[PDB]
Design a binder for this molecule. Structure first.
Ligand SMILES: COC(=O)CC[C@H](C[C@H](N)C(=O)O)C(=O)O
Ligand SMILES: [Cl-]
Ligand SMILES: [K+]
Ligand SMILES: [K+]
Length: 255
């Protein structure tokens, strides 16, 4: 098979971003970031070409009450894309719809909040309402709380899903909310690490709530899944993914 693979993705710093230039850019040249470096490395190793496209609805992917998916997950289900290359969380619920490569990065859910009120955990959030909290709508973190059998997280989901402001359109909007309101954002730990190094009034609250990985998504039965997995595992063993992360995360710290 010689054709270029269609890659669906989402803007999400520092994984996928619009490259800065004075020229009007087009095609793959528009994009840079951790996930673009990973895609280039896989493309080199495995000898394939690709065309990157932004998912129209700007969502990662979750199910509605009818069971229908949206976001990048839906793109893969409909075979509108060959690969989803993004910080896409590997979950068993999504495995009902799509396949994933093995993880290229591990992480956990944690809390992003303004330094100030010394809350120390999700339990501190769960037992009150003065500090509002939420997550990105139709993402893995939202779904984690929605499906949780943990009593504290159930309480949190009950509040989140009743407060129409709590679930934000995207990470950026969630971060802005933490900066402008008494609001704590439930979000993934490596992104929190990135944010708190650049926004010194924000901090991570508590440790990791859980453990998971980001993987490259594919339609079920993709002929590319297995070779992508092998290449990712190799890059991981040779510490190439650690170096790639250091590349995109490094910068000046905070006082
Ligand atoms: C790292 O990307 C983000 O922070 C976007 C929001 C994420 C999306 C998540 N990685 C997903 O795959 O649905 C979340 O549900 O917390
Ligand atoms: Cl929506
Ligand atoms: K080709
Ligand atoms: K430009």
């Amino acid at each position: 098979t010689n054709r270029s693979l269609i890659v669906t993705t989402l803007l999400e710093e520092p994984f996928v971003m619009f490259r800065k230039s004075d020229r009007t850019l087009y095609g793959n040249d528009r994009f840079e970031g951790y996930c673009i470096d990973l895609l280039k490395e896989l493309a080199h190793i495995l000898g394939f070409s690709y065309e990157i496209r932004l998912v129209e609805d700007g969502k990662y992917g979750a199910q509605d009450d009818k069971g229908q998916w949206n976001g990048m997950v839906k793109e893969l289900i409909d075979h509108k894309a060959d690969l989803a290359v993004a910080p896409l969380t590997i979950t068993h619920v999504r495995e009902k719809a799509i396949d994933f490569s093995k993880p290229f990065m591990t992480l956990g859910v944690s809390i992003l909040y303004r330094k100030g009120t010394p809350i120390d955990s999700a339990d501190d959030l769960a037992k009150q309402t003065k500090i509002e909290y939420g997550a990105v709508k139709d993402g893995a973190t939202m779904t984690f709380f929605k499906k949780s059998k943990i009593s504290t997280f159930e309480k949190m989901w009950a509040f989140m899903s009743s407060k129409p402001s709590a679930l934000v359109k995207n990470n950026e909007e969630g971060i802005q909310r933490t900066l402008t309101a008494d609001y704590a954002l439930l979000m993934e730990s490596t992104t929190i690490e990135y944010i708190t190094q650049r926004n010194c009034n924000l901090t991570q609250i508590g440790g990791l709530i859980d453990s998971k990985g980001y993987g490259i998504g594919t339609p079920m039965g993709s002929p590319y899944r297995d070779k992508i997995t092998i290449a990712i595992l190799q890059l991981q063993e040779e510490d190439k993914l650690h170096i790639m992360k250091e590349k995109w995360w490094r910068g000046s710290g905070c006082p």
